[PDB]
Amino acid sequence: PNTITEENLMKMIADGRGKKLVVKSCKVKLKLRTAKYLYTLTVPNADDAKSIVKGCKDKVEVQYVN
Amino acid sequence: TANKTLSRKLRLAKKTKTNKNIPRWVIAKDHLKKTWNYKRHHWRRSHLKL
């Protein structure tokens, strides 16, 4: 498991390296499940909004707060 | 022992498998009065050397 900067995150998205994304509410955690590692990014909700506006439609995103 | 070869395992397994009594229908069928299988054994007083 490891942490990632958002532009590398979009590289991963745009070259189809992820199988599922998770949004965790708490500062929001974005969790990306790739072949090798699980990558995590932490952004405020304002930035989560635009990252998901930019989210991929070949990409299953699932929400989570509890 | 917890670390035993397969050959010793198999011979021990056969002793365990055959340590049994005569069936009652066998007693009726063969018309027996002796009903104890005297080749049985018990772990406390046995010296299986296998």
Binding site: - | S7, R8, R11, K49, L50
Partner: protein, 87 residues
């Protein structure tokens, strides 16, 4: 303490199962059987113990091949087959 106490120091196997004769007689350190003499090519036999001889010999097992061959000779067609061959 050469008796009962010394008996409590026994947790070794001296002999194990023989691959040829099947008895608890194969010496695990010398690698040689004390009953049938394996791995020698010939079997261990001694005339000073005929009870040891009778315990394991020809006839105490199945005799499967020899049994069939003898009945074939004594009453079957084997000597006729011998005549046909030896013509």
């Amino acid at each position: 303490s050469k008796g009962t106490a010394s008996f409590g120091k026994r947790h070794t196997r001296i002999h194990g199962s023989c691959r040829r004769c099947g008895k608890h007689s194969f010496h695990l350190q010398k690698h040689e059987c004390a009953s049938c003499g394996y791995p020698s090519a010939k079997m261990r036999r001694y005339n000073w113990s005929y009870k040891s001889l009778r315990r394991r010999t020809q006839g105490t097992g199945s005799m499967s091949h020899m049994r069939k061959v003898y009945r074939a000779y004594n009453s079957g067609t084997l000597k006729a087959n011998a005549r046909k061959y030896l013509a």
